[PDB]
Design a binder for this molecule. Structure first.
Ligand code: FES
Ligand code: FES
Ligand code: FES
Ligand SMILES: [Fe+3]
Ligand SMILES: [Fe+3]
Ligand SMILES: [Fe+3]
Lengths: 193, 447, 193, 447, 193, 447
């Protein structure tokens, strides 16, 4: 539907994603994706990071969260790096982050943090070429509470690719988030969106 | 508070009143005596290389536009319209020949000049003196091997003199390496700490590494990992500490070229830095070539810090006494392969960026130490920086500055806060100089 | 169920809406409504405002968001206008707002805003009389981020009527929101709830 | 800061220090010299027409109850219990004979009198002097054709005299039209701007319209649309600007009766206003009948603004130097058909209400200009209001006040800030008068 | 899956709950639970507290919200009360709270409060022993607006047990919430999560 | 503001300036003259019974660690590292032999001593004087029947003398009952009120109960329920009010042992308290045994309050002039059956905890009264506390202190604020004593 020449504020990337979900809808797949993501969020919320890696994250994963530099809507000449990687992790790198979370000398983890995630707006569509690959889009509100009166709330859209792996379990092979707040007001982005 | 007389920093920079990290009246006074007076990091050539390229930057709490001119120079201007005071530029970077104000449409050039006013002839006739209505210009803008700094005070020393003895230590990496580029855009995050908390930590705190970063060392897969949980102390002359007249200082950890980077980069970097060092031995001598491939944790007074080798580059932008906006860039050597450049930039952000696992170790330390400075019973308490006092030297035959010939100490804290006191109690640069005529003698007392 | 004589805090309007959903539930309709709203939210989030009008909004639409004056619970004499219209738009009026969003001289839109919407608590029931008319209730959290450190979060319940239109696509014919915060603390209400 | 001596506003109101939009100490001082001294908008007869009807309103940072008495008068009282200081009324409007405090149950009448105290006889006996315990009353409450204003200062001029020369311009619409009603309730939104930012914009800023509102003009479908992107400048005597002794001022855009309204209202309104003007020609003369159907952008000093014809009515309620709570009502002519009244009210909110697309164009301008007033390098900078200076007149045979006979200029800024300086540097009304004895001469200098 | 000896940050209680949902999934039950909770939230949002008690709350209910004292991750000696009960109510006690909400002299309820609840991440599993008992997990964001500019937002995970009661309607028999923010920054916790 | 001369509280504590609940400069001054000078509640033996047990507590805006020592004593220390000022302990309670700082690893004992410094020998050699680097210790820590209080001022009276005449009223429940235990952890909630608002309410406000708590009385199912909506006033000598030299005071409601508790506890409690009273008649006399089972609403100056019988125990921790962090514990009698202990603790939280339905009735009263203290027209207004003035006695043969022999009055407000004025205008304890040498005469004037 979308014509980005007319819909002036829409990026080509965003228009491509609209197209993938508006066509060919499979209700059962949407339900499967909802289950997958709800279970993922549950594992993360209880800080079962090893279980998350083992049950939800594929060996070939790319887990990426970018922060895009604010540029003019009419900008057409400045062509330098548009973004930076808050996260751009392979499986090993996620594992390092998980070990860091679990280390008994991670002083910031005592007293124990409290996480609550809200996953909504789930959409799912099979990839046209890799019949093994399932595109899942979802939005997350992530609430982190610690040390009595520190409260940080994150908001984001997630563009995921999930593929069945060993044992035929669907696992995350790509997560992409373009984080919507340019200057973070949550002390850090040390949460798994 | 009478800043002429108040002893905020004790003699030889041995201690500081805790209130310096929490007192808002002092914060306002720093805007005048620290931020409006000293050199502040703006950008890098690599970020505004072509005519018309610009970025916005903070200078203290002020925001400026920093623009590459047609003649190749850089000028910087307050990001505030000369008419009714609206913020001129709302983006972080771009390319343009001028900037038009969205309120009444006044048009300014990239050179700050007021170039056009809508309906000038019909409304103002010949009454408008545009020549007097250019954007408020940052008086001084200078470069250190591509790194651009600004200063609002025309009376400041040249940037090179301001770096003082620290320049000698930075040159192998900043100059003799062939040059560095700054990889943007930066990460940006607000922390509930005073700007001095991270600044002091980066300028001379190696003591915290093994304990604060125990988890990151252990998990991280890095060259400094033997330190995790203070399981081990650095060797012999594993390094040194230095400080200078104008406040800048750093720690030196010999040979730690892979820095905080994960094992997925250690072999590659250790090869690359060693190869370059071999070539530099013939050009700058063995000591300086080794400094090139040694990890420097440095603060360029007041609020710009960095970890060379690791490639971390920080700006601690002040918001209020317990709020700082942290900007994090990556620095890379220009002659590195472009795939290495990319991986190094991601690794910098991976460890010290918004979701930097090492950075996260430091946050509670910085935040609570700052916040405790507001608490009634702690305001007049003394923060200690006496480690290594009475063992520092001045005028060494090989290593310049006030130097502590040990990897772990508080030498650089003392010099940072010797300069900070001198500024807070001075009304201008001349007074700062008068207050600093015996700076090294003060720092090396009892030795 | 609800007897407003006993349930003292419940308005007659609210009690009427409870009744419409508690009776006759159609699971398939709930799923259809979820899809419709998730797709609507996606189009809005990527700022595809023309696509939103074309694909989601009916020609006969009334899009209304009110702000109700705070009055006493026991008030029974003062009878002046109880509310005002933050939005009370027909299709043409929405179109004007869309053109305003897309105009290259809308200076407030540079750098580009970032929107993330969270749609939950979806309920759907067919209208008793107009078998063409579907009542959909849903709640929205709408996160707007701009200019580095401006973050505004809106919260609301939406009472919608959707009807199949041309090409048999279901489109919005009425949206009603009674905005819950009397004094806005988000700089403005310039978002499509 | 010594407000007796500090030049916050330069001679002839030609410039103002930027800090006036950000300095909290000055904000507190305005509470005393601006808000506690001058006339502030409360409500309209149409909103509290019957005995017992009340609304709450802000007066500066204070909240008052404004109540229609049995005798038809209106009295206003601080919304604060005389016992332990609890807020008495928690709603925005209603009808009641009195107000009971939820803390200890003290009962006050609609006339502010303390009428009952629970268990008075048993607890206080005859010791309680209720006659001395009435709610703190707003000293002065007056009406201008149904629009109710309050003033805490008994020494203030009558409201009519306070409006000074602006009254002549408002009368065609406020009086000769048959009267206006205020359609409530208002929209309410907090913006991160100083109250003076919108106040100055509404009092005399037509220059911003074509550029700031480019998108709204173009998209909006309105009578002033030829201005979009400064594509065109208004004609000849397309209008004028005026200012007065006590600070109030406005712009006049001849014949623009449909104002900001969309094409779905232009024909209907242009018919309606022209028809009434025809009738008024015989009663008040052609010039005044034309003023009736001309768009007036006006600020009634200090913080009440309006766009006649467009029907926008605003209160810029001060919170702190960079926070204002904006109240937006619609004004309609009483003799308009009730369906037109409804559509006009929605259109006012559509364009200038909480989701007002025109209002949104102005927000960043107001917010950043205010916020920049806190930034160190901008505090002592000068905001300019010199457009049209040296072309204003006083004592014109047809149009009263200090007048600039052009549609676009800064005449009204100069008068607003001439009055503002006089108030900020004066301890009372007498001093303000002493400081204003040559007000028009000051404004018309060089002419 | 979870081994708490390896997944060091995971509590035994949390690991037990993962297990109950990861095994034996019944899509229809998930949908039923979603309906139940959405309807519950709707009744609460319109302040139909009597209807809520009558239609959603079982006679044998335990409605409990705890606040856990912050202790060291490595703590193994201090064994005093770990938590306190913000709510720990039986049916009668809920009824008292409902009467308090409805009393015309509850001055804090004028002007009328505005509630909006967002229920997500719904999971449902039948109890292994009491085939009458259904375990439902869900997360809630609860927005309370009052008096012009007071806005309070609550975030929590809810561990519920629901059982069919009279008329065969499923009703709440246990709700347990471990409130994630230790020091409340919402003036009070006087909302039904 | 000159606190030496400013009359914040009028003679005999008859009124207070409303600004005391909103003025931030006064808040800062209270940190010095109220919080750093007087006795503040820390914890109870029952919460740190074993060696090594600790809790963190606030003392004013400061945070302290309160630790049970090996010898059975309790010591308390500022929760701030002696090195660079990081917060030492991040948890609320625990058991430990020492505390290690997460920044540089300095180790302190439970006795506050600096015990270890990483790499001491290699870095500091023998230069570090650890004996001078112990945590900053709270000068005074004392117990009242297991309730532990701290004071930063070594010059303070012993806690028992500080309680003055209030001690006599607390002893039946705190001592003769066999002792109380404190059930933790507390509820914790921030309210937008000044700490004095709840403190004054608990110290002597029975007048508000019937009206403020109308809904809770009616719905609640409690012994005081006849009061709902001021439907009825307490009887004859239904109670009394008292106040003391150092500010503490309370109301006494005879025989109300079940307090705010719901009918699901009234019979059980009325049996239990009556049974104990019967036994106490022989040990302490009938009057004191009755006091034991009478509801006391008390504030231990400045910011600790309680309702005996009901079992509510509060700390009003000050944050700023319009922010207070409320801690709520339950108190139970040690010899109660453990199932009763449990139910009573839940009932305390049920009625006065974070979701306390009675507590909720009070919030708007406390918040708006505090917030109105910032509003311009209310700052200099007078909050009234004259109810019962001229009927108080001193030196009664049976009931000690300044006493009002009626259940409802403002006696305790007057004594609380007589002490508050004396402190705010005094530089030390000696001056407070000088200002208090005729305290009871001042309170009983006109009688
Ligand atoms: S404020 Fe920039 S053109 Fe007027
Ligand atoms: S504060 Fe109003 S009756 Fe006491
Ligand atoms: S701040 Fe505590 S060890 Fe350094
Ligand atoms: Fe560090
Ligand atoms: Fe405008
Ligand atoms: Fe109370």
């Amino acid at each position: 539907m979308i014509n980005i020449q007319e819909d002036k504020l829409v990026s080509a990337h965003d228009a491509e994603e609209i197209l993938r979900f508006f066509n060919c809808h499979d209700s059962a797949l949407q339900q499967e994706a909802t289950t997958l993501l709800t279970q993922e969020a549950h594992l993360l919320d209880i800080q079962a990071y090893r279980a998350w890696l083992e049950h939800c994250v594929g060996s070939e994963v790319q887990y990426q969260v970018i922060s895009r530099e604010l540029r003019a809507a009419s900008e057409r000449r400045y062509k330098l790096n548009e973004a930076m990687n808050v996260y751009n992790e392979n499986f090993q790198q996620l594992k390092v982050r998980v070990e860091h979370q679990l280390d008994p000398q991670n002083w910031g983890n005592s007293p124990k943090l409290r996480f609550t995630r809200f996953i909504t707006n789930v959409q799912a569509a099979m990839d046209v070429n890799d019949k093994e690959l399932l595109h899942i889009r979802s939005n997350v509100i992530l609430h982190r509470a610690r040390r009595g009166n520190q409260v940080d709330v994150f908001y984001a859209a997630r563009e995921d690719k999930w593929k069945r792996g060993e044992g035929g379990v669907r696992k995350l092979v790509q997560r992409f988030v373009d984080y919507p707040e340019r200057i973070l007001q949550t002390h850090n982005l040390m949460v798994f969106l | 508070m009478n800043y002429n007389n108040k002893i905020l920093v004790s003699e030889s920079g041995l201690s500081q009143k805790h209130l310096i990290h929490g007192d808002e009246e002092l914060f306002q006074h720093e805007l005048k005596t620290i931020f409006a007076r000293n050199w502040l990091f703006l950008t890098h050539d690599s970020l505004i290389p072509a005519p018309g390229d610009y970025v916005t930057a903070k200078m203290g709490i002020d925001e400026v536009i920093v623009s590459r001119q047609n003649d190749g120079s850089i000028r910087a201007f307050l990001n505030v319209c000369r008419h009714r005071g609206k913020t001129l530029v709302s983006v972080e970077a771009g390319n343009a020949k001028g900037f038009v104000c969205s309120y009444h449409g006044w048009g300014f050039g990239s050179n700050g000049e007021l170039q056009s006013v809508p309906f000038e002839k019909d409304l103002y006739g010949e009454s408008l003196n545009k020549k007097c209505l250019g954007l408020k210009e940052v008086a001084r803008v200078e470069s250190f091997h591509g790194f651009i700094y600004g200063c609002f005070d025309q009376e400041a020393p040249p940037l090179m003199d301001y770096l003082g003895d620290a320049a000698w230590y930075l040159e192998p990496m900043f100059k003799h390496s062939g040059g560095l580029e700054l990889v943007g855009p930066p990460g940006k995050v607000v922390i509930k700490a005073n700007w001095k908390a991270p600044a002091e930590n980066f300028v001379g705190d190696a003591y915290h590494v093994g304990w604060t970063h125990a988890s990151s060392l252990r998990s991280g897969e890095s060259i400094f990992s033997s330190l995790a949980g203070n399981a081990a102390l650095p060797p012999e002359g594993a390094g040194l500490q230095m400080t200078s007249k104008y406040g800048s200082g750093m720690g030196v950890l010999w040979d730690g070229y892979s820095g905080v980077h994960s094992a997925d980069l250690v072999p590659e970097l250790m090869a690359f830095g060693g190869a370059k060092q071999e070539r530099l031995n013939k050009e700058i001598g063995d000591v300086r070539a080794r400094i090139y491939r040694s990890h420097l944790n440095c603060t360029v007074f007041p609020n710009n810090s960095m970890l060379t080798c690791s490639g971390v580059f920080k700006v601690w932008n002040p918001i209020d006494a317990n709020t700082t906006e942290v900007w994090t860039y990556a620095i890379v050597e220009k002659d590195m392969p472009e795939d290495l450049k990319r991986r190094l930039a991601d690794s910098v952000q991976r460890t010290f960026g918004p979701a930097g696992f090492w950075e996260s170790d430091d946050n509670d330390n910085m935040e609570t130490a700052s916040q405790n400075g507001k608490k009634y019973q702690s305001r007049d308490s003394d923060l200690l920086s006496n480690l290594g006092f009475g063992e520092d030297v001045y005028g060494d035959a090989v290593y310049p500055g006030v130097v502590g010939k040990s990897a772990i100490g508080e030498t650089s804290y003392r010099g940072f806060y010797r300069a900070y006191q001198a500024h807070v109690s001075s009304s201008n640069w001349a007074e700062f100089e008068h207050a600093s005529s015996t700076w090294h003698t003060e720092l090396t007392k009892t030795t």
